[PDB]
Ligand binder design. Sequence first.
Ligand SMILES: *C(=O)[C@@H](NC(=O)[C@H](N)c1ccccc1)[C@@H]1N[C@@H](C(=O)O)C(C)(C)S1
Length: 244
Amino acid sequence: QPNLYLSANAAAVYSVENGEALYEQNADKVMPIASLSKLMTAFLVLEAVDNNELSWDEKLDLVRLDAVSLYAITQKRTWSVRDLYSAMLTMSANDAAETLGDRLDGADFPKEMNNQAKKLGMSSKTTFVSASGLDVDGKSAVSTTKDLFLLSSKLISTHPEVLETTSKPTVTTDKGAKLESTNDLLGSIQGLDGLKTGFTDEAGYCFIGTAERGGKRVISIVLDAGTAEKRFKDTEKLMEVGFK
Ligand SMILES: *C(=O)[C@@H](NC(=O)[C@H](N)c1ccccc1)[C@@H]1N[C@@H](C(=O)O)C(C)(C)S1
């Protein structure tokens, strides 16, 4: 049970095969999660396509934010559902995430996120507030590492194709737009193919990682590391523990 000396305030790594913790630090602590919220949006986008309620080719106009935004970078407002989903997962474009949630359930999308959270076994310490994880009316999206593990594991087992997108260091859209991934560990740790970064002043630097080697998948959670690099340094330590 050796200490890792992590930057993160809360961190953990779990085996997917049995859901068991291999390392835990403040695993029950309620923590701001910010852009990690986009994994729930991704889950609900994928449920919508499967349920014949959403088309990958439907074109949508980016909602305007009050943040990293797809519109500002490109000056293009109209995007397919596919590209909005890629932008949300790769570059963490808030306006992309909010456009997807609004198409799915309008104003009622946070209620749908928390409905789904309870459905996937996440504890009542989890609260989503928005499709992007941006604060809403001063309230913040919060969760625990244990709850984030359950979300991620359910997302990967229910929709394994999420990793087809999260494993790409660059997603190039059909019309040539190159969306650069925030996951700098891709191509560095063997088997790593996800999952999602986040950062606010309050949440610090966060990252949910996942890797698989020889049938064994692990999911790592890093919350409130001190720099953009340190959340990845913590992930390397956790990923070493996960495959020991
Ligand atoms: C999710 O956490 C997003 N964070 C923000 O939009 C912050 N409000 C912000 C950060 C910096 C400047 C202005 C606002 C996105 N996820 C982050 C991440 O993946 O590390 C982001 C910086 C790419 S933005």
